[PDB]
Short mmCIF file of N, CA and C and ligand atoms in Angstrom, two decimals:
data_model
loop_
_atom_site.label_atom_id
_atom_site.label_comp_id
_atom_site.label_asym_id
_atom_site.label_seq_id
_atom_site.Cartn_x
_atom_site.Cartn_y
_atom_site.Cartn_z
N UNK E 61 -12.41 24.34 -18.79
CA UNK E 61 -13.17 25.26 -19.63
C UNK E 61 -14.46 25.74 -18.96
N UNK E 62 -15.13 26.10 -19.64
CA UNK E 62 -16.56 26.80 -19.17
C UNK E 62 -17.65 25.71 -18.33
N UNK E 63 -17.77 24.67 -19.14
CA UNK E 63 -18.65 23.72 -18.25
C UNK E 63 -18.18 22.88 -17.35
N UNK E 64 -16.79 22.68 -18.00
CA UNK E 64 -16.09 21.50 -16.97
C UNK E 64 -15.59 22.00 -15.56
N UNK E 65 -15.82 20.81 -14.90
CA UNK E 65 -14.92 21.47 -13.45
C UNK E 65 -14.47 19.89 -12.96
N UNK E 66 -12.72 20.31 -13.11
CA UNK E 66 -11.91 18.92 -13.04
C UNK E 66 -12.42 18.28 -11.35
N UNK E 67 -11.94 17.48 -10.94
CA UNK E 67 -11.90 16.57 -10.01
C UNK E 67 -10.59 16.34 -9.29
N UNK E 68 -10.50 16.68 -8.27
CA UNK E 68 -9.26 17.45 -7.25
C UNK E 68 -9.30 16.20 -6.23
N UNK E 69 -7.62 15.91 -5.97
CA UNK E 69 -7.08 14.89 -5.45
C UNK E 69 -6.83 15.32 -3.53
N UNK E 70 -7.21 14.26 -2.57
CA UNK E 70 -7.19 14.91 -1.19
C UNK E 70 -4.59 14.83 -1.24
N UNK E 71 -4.55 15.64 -0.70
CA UNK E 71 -3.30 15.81 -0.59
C UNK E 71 -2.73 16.43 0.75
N UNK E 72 -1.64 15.84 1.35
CA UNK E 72 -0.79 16.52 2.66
C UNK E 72 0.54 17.24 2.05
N UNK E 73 -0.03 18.54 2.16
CA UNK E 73 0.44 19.91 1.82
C UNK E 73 2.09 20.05 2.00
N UNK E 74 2.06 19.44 3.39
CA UNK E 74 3.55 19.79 3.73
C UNK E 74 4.47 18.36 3.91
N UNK E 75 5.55 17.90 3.31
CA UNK E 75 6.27 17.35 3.55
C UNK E 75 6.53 17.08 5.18
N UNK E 76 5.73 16.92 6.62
CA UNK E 76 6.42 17.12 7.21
C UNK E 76 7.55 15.86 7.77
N UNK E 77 8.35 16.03 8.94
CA UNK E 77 9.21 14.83 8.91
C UNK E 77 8.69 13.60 9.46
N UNK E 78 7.32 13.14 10.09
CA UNK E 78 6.02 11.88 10.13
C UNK E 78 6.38 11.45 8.36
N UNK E 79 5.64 12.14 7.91
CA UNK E 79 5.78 11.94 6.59
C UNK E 79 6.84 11.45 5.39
N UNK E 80 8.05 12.07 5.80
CA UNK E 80 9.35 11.45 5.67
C UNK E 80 9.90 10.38 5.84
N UNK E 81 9.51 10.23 7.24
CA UNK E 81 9.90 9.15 7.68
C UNK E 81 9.28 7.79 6.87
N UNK E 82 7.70 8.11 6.63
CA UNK E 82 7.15 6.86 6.35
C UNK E 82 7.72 6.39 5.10
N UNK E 83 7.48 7.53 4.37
CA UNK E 83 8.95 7.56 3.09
C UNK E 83 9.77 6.71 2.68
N UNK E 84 10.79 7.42 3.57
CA UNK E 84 11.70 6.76 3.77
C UNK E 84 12.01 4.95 4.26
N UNK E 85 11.04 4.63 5.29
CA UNK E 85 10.93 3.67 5.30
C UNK E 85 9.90 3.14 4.40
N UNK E 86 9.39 3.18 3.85
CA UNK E 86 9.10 2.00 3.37
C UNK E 86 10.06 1.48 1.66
N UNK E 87 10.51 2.89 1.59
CA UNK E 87 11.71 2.91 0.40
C UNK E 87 12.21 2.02 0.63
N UNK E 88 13.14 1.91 2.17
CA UNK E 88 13.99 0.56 2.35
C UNK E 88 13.41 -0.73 2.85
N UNK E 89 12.16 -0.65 3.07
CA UNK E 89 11.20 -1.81 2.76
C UNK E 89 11.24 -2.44 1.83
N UNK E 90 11.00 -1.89 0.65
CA UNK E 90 11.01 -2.03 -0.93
C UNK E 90 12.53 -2.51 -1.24
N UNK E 91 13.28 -2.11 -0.68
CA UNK E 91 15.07 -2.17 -0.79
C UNK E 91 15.01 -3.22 -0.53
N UNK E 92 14.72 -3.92 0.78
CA UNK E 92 14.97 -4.98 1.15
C UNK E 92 14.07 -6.20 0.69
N UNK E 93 12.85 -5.90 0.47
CA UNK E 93 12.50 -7.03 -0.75
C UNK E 93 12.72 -7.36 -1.78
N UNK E 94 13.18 -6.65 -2.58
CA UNK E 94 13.36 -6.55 -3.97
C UNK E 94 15.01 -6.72 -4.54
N UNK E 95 15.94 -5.76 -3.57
CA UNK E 95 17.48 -6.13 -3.59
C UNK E 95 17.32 -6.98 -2.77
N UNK E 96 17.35 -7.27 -1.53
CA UNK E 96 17.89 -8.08 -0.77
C UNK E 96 17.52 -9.59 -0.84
N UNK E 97 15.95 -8.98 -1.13
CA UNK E 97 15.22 -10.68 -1.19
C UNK E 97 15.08 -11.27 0.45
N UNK E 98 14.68 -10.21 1.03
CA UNK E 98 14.28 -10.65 2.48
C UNK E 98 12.84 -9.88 2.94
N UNK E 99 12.28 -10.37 3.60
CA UNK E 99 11.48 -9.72 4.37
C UNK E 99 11.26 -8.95 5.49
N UNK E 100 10.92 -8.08 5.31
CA UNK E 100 10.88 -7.05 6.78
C UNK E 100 9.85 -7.17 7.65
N UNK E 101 9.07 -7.91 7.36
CA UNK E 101 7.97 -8.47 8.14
C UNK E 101 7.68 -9.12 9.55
N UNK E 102 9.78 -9.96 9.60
CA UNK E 102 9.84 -10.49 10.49
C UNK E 102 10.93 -10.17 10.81
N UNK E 103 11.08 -10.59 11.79
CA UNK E 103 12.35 -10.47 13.14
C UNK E 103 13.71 -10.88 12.37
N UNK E 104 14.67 -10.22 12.07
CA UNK E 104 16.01 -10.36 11.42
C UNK E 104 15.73 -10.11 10.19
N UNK E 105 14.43 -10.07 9.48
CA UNK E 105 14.30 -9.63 8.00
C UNK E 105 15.30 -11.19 7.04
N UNK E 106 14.26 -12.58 7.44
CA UNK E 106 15.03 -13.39 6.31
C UNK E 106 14.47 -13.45 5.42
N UNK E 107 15.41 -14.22 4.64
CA UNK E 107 14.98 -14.08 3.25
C UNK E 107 13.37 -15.20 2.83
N UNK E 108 13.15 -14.53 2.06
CA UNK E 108 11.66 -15.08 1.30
C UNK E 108 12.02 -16.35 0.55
N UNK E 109 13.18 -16.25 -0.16
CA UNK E 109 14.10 -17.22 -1.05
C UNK E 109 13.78 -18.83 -0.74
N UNK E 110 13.17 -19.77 -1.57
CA UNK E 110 13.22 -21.02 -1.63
C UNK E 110 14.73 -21.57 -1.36
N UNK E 111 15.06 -22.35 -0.40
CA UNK E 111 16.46 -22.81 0.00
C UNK E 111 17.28 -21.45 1.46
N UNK E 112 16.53 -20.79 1.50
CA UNK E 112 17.37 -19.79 2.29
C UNK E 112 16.18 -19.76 3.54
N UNK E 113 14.71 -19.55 3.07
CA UNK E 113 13.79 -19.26 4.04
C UNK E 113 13.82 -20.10 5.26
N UNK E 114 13.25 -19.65 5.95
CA UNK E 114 12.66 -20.28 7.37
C UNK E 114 11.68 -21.15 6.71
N UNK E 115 12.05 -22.56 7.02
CA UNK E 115 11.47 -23.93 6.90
C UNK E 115 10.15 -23.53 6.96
N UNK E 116 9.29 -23.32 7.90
CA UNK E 116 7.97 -23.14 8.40
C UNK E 116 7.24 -22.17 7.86
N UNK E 117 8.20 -21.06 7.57
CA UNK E 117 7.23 -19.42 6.82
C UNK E 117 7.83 -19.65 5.25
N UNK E 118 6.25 -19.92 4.37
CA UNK E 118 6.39 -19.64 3.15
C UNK E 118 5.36 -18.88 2.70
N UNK E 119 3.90 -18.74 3.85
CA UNK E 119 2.71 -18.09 3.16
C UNK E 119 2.68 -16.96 4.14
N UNK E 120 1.82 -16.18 3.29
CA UNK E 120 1.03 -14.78 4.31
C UNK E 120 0.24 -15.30 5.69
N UNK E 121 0.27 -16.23 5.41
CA UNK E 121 -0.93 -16.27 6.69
C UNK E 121 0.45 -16.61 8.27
N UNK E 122 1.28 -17.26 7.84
CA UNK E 122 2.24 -17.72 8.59
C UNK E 122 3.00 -16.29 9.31
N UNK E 123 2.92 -15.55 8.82
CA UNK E 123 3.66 -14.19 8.81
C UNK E 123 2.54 -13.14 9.47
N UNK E 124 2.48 -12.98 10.88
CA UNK E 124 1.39 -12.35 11.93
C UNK E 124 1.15 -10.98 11.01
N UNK E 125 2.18 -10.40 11.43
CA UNK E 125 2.05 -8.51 10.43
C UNK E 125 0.92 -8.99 9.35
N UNK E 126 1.42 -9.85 8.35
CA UNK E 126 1.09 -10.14 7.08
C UNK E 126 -0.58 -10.85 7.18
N UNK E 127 -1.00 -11.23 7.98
CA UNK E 127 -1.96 -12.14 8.51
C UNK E 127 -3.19 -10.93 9.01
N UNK E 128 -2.17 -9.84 10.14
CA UNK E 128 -3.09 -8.76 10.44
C UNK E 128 -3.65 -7.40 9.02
N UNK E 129 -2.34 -7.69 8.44
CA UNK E 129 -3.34 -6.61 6.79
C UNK E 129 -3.65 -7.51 6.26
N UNK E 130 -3.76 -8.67 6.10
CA UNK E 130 -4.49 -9.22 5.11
C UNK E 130 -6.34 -8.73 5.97
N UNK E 131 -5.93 -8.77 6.81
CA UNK E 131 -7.98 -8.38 7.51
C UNK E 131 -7.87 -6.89 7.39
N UNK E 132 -7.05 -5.92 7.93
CA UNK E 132 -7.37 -4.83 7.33
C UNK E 132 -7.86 -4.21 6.03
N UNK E 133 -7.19 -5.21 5.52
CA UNK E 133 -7.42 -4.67 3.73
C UNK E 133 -9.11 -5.44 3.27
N UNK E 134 -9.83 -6.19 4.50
CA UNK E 134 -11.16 -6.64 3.91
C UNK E 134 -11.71 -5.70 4.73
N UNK E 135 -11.61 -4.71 5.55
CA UNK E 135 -12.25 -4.08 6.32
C UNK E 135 -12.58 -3.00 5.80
N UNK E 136 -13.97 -2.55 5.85
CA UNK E 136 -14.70 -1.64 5.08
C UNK E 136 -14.12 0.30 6.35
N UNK E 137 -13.92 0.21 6.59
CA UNK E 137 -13.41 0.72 7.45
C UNK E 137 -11.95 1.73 6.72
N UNK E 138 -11.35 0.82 6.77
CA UNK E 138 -9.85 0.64 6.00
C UNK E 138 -9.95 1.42 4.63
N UNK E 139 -11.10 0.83 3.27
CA UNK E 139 -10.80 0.66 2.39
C UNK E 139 -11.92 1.92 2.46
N UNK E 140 -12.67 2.35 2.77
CA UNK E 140 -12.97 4.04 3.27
C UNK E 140 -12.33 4.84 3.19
N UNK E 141 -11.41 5.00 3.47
CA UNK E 141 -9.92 5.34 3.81
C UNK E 141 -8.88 5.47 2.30
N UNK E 142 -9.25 4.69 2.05
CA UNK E 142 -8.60 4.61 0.71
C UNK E 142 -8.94 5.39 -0.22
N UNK E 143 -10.66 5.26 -0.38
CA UNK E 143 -11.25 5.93 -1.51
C UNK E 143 -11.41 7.77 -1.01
N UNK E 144 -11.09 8.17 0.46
CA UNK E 144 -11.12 9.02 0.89
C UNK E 144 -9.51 9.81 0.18
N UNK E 145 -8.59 8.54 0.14
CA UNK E 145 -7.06 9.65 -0.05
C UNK E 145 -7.08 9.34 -1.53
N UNK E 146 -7.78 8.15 -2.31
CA UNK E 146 -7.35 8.47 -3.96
C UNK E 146 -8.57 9.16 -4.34
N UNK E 147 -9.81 9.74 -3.58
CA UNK E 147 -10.70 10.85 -4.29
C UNK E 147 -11.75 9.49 -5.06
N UNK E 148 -12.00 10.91 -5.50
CA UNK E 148 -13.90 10.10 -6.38
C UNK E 148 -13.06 9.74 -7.88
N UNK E 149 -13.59 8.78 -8.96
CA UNK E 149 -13.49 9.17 -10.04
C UNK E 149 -12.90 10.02 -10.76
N UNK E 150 -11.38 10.17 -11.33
CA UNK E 150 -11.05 11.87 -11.84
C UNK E 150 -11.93 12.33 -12.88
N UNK E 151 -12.22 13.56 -13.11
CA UNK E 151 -13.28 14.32 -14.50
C UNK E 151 -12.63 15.19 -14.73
N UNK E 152 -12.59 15.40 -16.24
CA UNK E 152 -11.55 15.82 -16.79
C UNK E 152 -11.81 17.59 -16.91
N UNK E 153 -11.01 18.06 -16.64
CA UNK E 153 -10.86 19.41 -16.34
C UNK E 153 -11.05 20.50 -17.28
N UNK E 154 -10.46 20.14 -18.57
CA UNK E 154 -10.62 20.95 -19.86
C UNK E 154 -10.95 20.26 -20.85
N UNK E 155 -11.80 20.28 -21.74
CA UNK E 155 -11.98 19.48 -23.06
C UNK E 155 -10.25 19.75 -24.45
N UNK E 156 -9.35 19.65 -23.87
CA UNK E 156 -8.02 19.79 -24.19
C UNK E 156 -7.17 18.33 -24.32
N UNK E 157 -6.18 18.72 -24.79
CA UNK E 157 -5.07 18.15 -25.62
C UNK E 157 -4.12 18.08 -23.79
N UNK E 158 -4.14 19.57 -23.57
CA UNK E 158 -3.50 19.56 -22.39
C UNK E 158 -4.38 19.12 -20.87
N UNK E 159 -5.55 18.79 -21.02
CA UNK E 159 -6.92 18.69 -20.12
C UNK E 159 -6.51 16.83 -20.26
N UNK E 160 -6.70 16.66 -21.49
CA UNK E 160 -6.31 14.88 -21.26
C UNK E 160 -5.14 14.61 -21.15
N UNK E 161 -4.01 15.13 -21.11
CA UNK E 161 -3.12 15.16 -21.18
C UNK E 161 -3.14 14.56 -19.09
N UNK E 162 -3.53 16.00 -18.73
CA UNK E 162 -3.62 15.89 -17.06
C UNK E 162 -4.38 14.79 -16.79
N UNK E 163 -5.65 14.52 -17.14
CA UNK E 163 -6.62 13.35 -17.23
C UNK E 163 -5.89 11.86 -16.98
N UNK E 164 -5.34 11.41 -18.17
CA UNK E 164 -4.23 10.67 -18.29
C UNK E 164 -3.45 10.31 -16.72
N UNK E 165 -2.97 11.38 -16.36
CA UNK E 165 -2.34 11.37 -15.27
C UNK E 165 -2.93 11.55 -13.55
N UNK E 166 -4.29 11.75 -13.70
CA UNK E 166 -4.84 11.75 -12.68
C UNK E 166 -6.10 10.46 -12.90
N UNK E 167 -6.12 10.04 -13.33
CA UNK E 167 -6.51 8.00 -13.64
C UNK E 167 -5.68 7.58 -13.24
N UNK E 168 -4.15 7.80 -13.66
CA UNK E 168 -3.19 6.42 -13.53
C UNK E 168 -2.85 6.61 -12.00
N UNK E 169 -2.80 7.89 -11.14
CA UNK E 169 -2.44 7.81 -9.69
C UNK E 169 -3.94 7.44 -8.82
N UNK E 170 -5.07 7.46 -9.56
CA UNK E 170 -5.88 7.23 -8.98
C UNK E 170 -6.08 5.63 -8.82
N UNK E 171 -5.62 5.15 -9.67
CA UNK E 171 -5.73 3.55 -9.77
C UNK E 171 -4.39 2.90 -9.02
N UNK E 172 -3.75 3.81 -8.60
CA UNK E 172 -2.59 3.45 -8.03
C UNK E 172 -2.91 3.09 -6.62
N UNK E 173 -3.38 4.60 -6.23
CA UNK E 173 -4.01 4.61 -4.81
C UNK E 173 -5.08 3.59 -4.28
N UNK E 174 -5.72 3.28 -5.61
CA UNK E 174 -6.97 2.89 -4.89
C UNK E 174 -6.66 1.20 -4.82
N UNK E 175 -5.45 0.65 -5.58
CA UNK E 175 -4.74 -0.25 -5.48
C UNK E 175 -3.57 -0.49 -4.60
N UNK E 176 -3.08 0.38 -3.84
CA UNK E 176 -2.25 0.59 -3.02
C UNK E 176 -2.77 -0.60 -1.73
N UNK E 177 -2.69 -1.64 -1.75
CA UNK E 177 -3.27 -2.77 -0.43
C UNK E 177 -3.61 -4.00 -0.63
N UNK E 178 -3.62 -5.05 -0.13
CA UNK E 178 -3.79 -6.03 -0.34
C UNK E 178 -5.34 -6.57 -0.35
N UNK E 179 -6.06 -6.11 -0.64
CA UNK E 179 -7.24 -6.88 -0.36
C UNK E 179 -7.94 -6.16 -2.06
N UNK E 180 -7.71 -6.04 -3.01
CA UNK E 180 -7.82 -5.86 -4.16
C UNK E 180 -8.26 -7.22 -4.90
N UNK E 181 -9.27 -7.18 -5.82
CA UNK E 181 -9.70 -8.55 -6.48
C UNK E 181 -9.22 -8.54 -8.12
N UNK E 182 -9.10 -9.86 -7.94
CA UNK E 182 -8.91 -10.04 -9.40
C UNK E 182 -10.27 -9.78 -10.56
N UNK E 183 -9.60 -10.23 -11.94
CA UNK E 183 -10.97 -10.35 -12.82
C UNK E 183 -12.28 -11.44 -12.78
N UNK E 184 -12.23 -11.61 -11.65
CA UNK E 184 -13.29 -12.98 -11.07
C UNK E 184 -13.96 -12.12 -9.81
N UNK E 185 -13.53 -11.45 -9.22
CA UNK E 185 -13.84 -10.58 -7.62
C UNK E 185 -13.12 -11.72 -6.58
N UNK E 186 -12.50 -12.17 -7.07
CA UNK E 186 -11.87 -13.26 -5.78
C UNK E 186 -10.36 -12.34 -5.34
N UNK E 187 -9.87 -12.19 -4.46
CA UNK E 187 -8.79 -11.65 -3.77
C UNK E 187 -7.65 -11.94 -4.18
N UNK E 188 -6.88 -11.29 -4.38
CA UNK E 188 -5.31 -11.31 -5.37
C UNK E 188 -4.80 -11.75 -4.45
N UNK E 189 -4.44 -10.88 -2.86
CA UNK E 189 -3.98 -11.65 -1.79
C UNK E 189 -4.61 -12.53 -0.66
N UNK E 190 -4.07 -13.74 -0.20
CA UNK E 190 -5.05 -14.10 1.19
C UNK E 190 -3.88 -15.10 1.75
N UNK E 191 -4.53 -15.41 3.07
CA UNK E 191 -3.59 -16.18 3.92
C UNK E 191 -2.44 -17.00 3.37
N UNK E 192 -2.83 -17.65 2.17
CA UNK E 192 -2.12 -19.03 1.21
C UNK E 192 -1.52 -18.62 0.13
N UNK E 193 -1.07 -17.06 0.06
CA UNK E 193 -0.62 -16.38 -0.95
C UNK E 193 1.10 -16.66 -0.61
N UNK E 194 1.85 -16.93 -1.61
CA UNK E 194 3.11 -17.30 -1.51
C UNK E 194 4.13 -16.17 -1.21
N UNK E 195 4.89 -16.26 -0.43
CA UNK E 195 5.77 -15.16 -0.02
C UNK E 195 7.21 -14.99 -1.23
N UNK E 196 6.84 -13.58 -1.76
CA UNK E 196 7.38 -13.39 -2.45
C UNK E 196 7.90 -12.04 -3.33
N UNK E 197 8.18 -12.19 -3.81
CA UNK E 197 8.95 -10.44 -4.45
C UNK E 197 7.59 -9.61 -4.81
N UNK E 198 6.50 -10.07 -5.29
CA UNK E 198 5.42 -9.45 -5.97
C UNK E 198 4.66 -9.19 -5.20
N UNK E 199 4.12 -10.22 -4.38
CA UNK E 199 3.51 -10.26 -3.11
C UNK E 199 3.84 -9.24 -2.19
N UNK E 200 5.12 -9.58 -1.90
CA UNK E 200 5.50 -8.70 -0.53
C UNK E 200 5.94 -7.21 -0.50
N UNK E 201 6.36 -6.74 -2.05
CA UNK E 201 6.12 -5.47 -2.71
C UNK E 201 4.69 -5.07 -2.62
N UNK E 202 3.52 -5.49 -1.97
CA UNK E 202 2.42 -5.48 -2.57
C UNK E 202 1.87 -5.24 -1.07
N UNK E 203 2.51 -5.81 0.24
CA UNK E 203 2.20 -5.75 1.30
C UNK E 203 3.15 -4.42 1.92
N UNK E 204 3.98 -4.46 1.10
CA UNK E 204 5.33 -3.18 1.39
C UNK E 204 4.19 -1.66 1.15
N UNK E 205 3.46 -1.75 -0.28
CA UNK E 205 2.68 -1.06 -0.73
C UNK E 205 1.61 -0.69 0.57
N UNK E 206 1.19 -1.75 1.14
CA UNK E 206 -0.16 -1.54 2.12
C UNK E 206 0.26 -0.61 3.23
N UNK E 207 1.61 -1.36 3.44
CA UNK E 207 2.32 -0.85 5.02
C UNK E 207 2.39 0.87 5.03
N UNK E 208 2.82 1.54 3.50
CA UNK E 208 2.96 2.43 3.46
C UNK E 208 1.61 3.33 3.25
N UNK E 209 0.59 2.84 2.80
CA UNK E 209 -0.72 3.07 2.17
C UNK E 209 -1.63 3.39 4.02
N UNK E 210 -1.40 2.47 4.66
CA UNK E 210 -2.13 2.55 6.25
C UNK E 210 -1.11 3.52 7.13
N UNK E 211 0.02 3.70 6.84
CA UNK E 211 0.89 4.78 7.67
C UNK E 211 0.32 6.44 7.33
N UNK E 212 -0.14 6.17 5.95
CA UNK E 212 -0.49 7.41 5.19
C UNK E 212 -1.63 8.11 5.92
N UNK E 213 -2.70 6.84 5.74
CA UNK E 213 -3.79 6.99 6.97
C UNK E 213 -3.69 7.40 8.03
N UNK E 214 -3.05 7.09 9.16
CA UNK E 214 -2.97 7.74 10.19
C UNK E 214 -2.45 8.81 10.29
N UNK E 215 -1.17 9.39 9.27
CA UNK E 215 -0.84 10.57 9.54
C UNK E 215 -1.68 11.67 9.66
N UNK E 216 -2.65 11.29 8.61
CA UNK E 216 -4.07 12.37 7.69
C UNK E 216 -5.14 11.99 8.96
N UNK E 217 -5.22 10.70 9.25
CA UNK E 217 -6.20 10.62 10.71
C UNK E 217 -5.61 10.11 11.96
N UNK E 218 -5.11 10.66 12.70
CA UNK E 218 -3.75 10.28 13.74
C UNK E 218 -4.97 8.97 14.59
N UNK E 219 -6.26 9.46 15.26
CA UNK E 219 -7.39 8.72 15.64
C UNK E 219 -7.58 7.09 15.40
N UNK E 220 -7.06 7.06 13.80
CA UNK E 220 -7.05 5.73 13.27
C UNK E 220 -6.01 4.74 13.65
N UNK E 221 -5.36 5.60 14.45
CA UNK E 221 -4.11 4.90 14.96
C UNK E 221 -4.62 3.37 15.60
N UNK E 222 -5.59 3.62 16.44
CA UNK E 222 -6.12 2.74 17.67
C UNK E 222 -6.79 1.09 16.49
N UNK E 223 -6.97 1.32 15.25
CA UNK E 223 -7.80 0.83 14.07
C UNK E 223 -6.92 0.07 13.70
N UNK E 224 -5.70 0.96 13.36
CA UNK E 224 -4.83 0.51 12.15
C UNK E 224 -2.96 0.47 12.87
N UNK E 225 -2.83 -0.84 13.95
CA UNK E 225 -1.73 -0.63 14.99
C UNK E 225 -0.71 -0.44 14.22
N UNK E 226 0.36 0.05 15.08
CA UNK E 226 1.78 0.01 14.49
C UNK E 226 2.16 -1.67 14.37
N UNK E 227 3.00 -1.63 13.19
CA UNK E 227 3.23 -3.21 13.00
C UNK E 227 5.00 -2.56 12.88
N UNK E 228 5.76 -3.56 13.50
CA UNK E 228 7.07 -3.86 13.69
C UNK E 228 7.68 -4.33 12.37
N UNK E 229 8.56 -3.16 11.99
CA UNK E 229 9.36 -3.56 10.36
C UNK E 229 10.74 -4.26 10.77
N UNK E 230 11.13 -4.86 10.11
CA UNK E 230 12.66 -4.92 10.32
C UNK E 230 13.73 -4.85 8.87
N UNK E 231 14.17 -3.80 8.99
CA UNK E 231 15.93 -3.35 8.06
C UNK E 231 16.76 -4.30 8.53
N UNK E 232 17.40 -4.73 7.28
CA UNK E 232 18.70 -5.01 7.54
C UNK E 232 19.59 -4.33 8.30
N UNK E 233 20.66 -4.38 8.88
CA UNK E 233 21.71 -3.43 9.66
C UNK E 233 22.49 -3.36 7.86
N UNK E 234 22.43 -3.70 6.99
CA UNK E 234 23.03 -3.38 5.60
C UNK E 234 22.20 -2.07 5.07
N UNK E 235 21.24 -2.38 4.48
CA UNK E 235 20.41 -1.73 3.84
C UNK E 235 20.22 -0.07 4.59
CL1 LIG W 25 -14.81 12.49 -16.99
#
């Protein structure tokens, strides 16, 4: 309306195939934690599963990839980055039915984004994830989330590459 002036989300315009790709993988990231019940974190992608896992890997900290975002995600650096791709605060655009309507919907992706990583605190400010965090469907959906959240980053800042390394996924040959 007349006084208001909504609050505009940073966005990559074009689908290109960088972008796809990350997509795409981390879709079957998500595939493979969630159907498969394995991890892609490590070498053959085993399973997370109590009775199936690797004897020795049950926590984040045990799991290098998982060990290296857990410090990314405390790094002010990183989480810059974050508040750079989910934007400021949304403000609502029209004093409307259809204005909150959009409102509504530009909160809930904003809290998405800005939750998109592991280094997020609980209702205490203490860290949801850290080294001793149990490997698991919620968890590792949650690190699946980051993997794709820091790929995003570099596409939008290729520079950050050197910041934020490539970490080694592994697919099933199923999936
Ligand atoms: Cl507002």
């Amino acid at each position: 309306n007349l006084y208001f002036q909504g609050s505009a989300t940073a966005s990559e315009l074009l689908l290109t195939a960088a972008l796809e790709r990350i997509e795409d993988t981390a879709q079957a990231m998500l595939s493979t934690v969630i159907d498969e019940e394995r991890n892609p974190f490590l070498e053959g992608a085993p399973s997370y599963l109590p009775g199936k896992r690797p004897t020795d890997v049950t926590t984040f900290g045990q799991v290098p990839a998982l060990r290296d975002m857990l410090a990314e995600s405390r790094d002010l650096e990183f989480l810059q980055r974050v508040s750079d791709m989910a934007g400021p605060s949304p403000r609502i655009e029209d004093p409307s039915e259809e204005g909150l309507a959009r409102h509504y919907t530009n909160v809930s992706n904003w809290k998405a984004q800005k939750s998109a990583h592991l280094g997020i605190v609980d209702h205490l400010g203490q860290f949801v994830y850290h080294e001793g965090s149990p490997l698991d469907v919620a968890t590792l959906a949650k690190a699946v989330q980051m993997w794709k959240t820091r790929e995003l980053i570099v596409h939008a800042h290729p520079q950050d590459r050197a910041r934020f390394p490539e970490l080694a996924v592994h697919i099933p040959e199923q999936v």
